[PDB]
Design a protein around this ligand. Structure first.
Ligand code: 7UC
Ligand code: AKG
Ligand code: FE
Length: 296
């Protein structure tokens, strides 16, 4: 340690900026303070990071245990644990996958054991149409009308990647039904309580997203009408295509920034493709000292 400085946004405003962070030299107390900022301010922006892919993984390893993405076409060619979102060819070749995350989601919400912390290190940043949208789903839960809180009490949700699974090069010429069935086998839909208690803060989190949450079911396992999910998406801001809803936060960044966020509390989305500007980002996703929630 000696010079990491965390500047948290005041009051209830989301976010924090972190100056002087060096993952190779930060103390244990520095790391614990950064993690507390992540869980309470939700998004920590590390400033002035000039890191190789290997150094980025090393930074993630200070915060938790990295997990590689289960579909390897997303993986960086040198570092399996880095997920690459890219639409800039390198020597004419596609690296990673283009145009990822164009829907509201929490990362790995369709998997049984999601990690708690996402790290994004932007490489190529659109000049005009840059940033990622976020909604804090604990704050969104707290803002629901009381009767809507009651209606989801006791319920469970089903989450699946089936809508947004991306076709891979080796899928060409396969019948689509075989791919659909392979997705159901490899990544079956996962049931979770509709709300859970955040292990680090005690907040109640509404754990749903328009992109991955495919059904809601009662306290006894019987499917409820998806009109309930639509009303929850509506109330929490996930159906507002203008992105002006009060719950929505647009997180911008500049070169050298590195975003670290709470993947229990937040859902996120890419912006509309209103410009032809490219995006390249590297992502590391880490498990911290607790499961996503205590029922895992
Ligand atoms: C479906 C996405 C990948 C993609 O948007 O192409 N998975 C992100 C994640 O849930 O970690
Ligand atoms: O969830 C996905 O589709 C993968 C990409 C992603 O998580 C993101 O772009 O934020
Ligand atoms: Fe994502």
């Amino acid at each position: 340690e000696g010079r990491m400085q965390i500047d948290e946004q005041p009051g209830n405003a989301i976010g924090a900026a972190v100056e002087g962070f060096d993952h190779a030299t930060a103390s244990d107390a520095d790391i614990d303070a950064l993690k507390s900022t992540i869980y309470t301010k939700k998004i920590a922006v590390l400033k002035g990071q000039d890191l190789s892919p290997q150094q980025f993984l090393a930074l993630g390893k200070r915060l938790g245990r990295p997990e590689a993405y289960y579909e390897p076409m997303y993986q960086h060619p040198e570092v399996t644990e880095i997920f690459v979102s890219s639409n800039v060819p390198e020597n004419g070749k596609q690296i990673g996958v283009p145009k990822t995350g164009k829907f509201w989601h929490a990362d790995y919400q369709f998997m049984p054991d999601p990690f708690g912390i996402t790290l994004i290190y932007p490489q190529v940043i659109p000049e005009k149409n840059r940033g990622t949208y976020f909604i804090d789903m604990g704050r969104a839960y707290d803002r629901l009308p009381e009767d809507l809180k009651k209606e989801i009490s006791g319920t469970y949700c089903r989450h699946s990647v089936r809508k947004y699974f991306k076709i891979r090069p080796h899928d060409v010429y396969r019948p689509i039904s075989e791919i659909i069935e392979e997705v159901e086998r490899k990544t079956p839909a996962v049931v979770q309580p509709t709300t859970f208690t955040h292990p680090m803060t005690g907040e109640t989190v509404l754990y749903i997203s328009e992109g991955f949450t495919v059904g809601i079911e009662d306290q006894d396992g019987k499917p409820l009408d998806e009109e309930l999910l639509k009303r929850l998406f509506d109330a929490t801001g996930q159906l507002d295509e203008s992105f002006e809803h009060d719950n929505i936060h647009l997180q911008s960044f500049e070169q050298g920034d590195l975003l670290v966020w709470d993947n229990r509390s937040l859902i996120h989305r890419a912006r509309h493709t209103t410009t032809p500007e490219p995006t390249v980002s590297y992502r590391v996703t880490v498990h911290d000292e607790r499961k996503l929630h205590d029922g895992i």
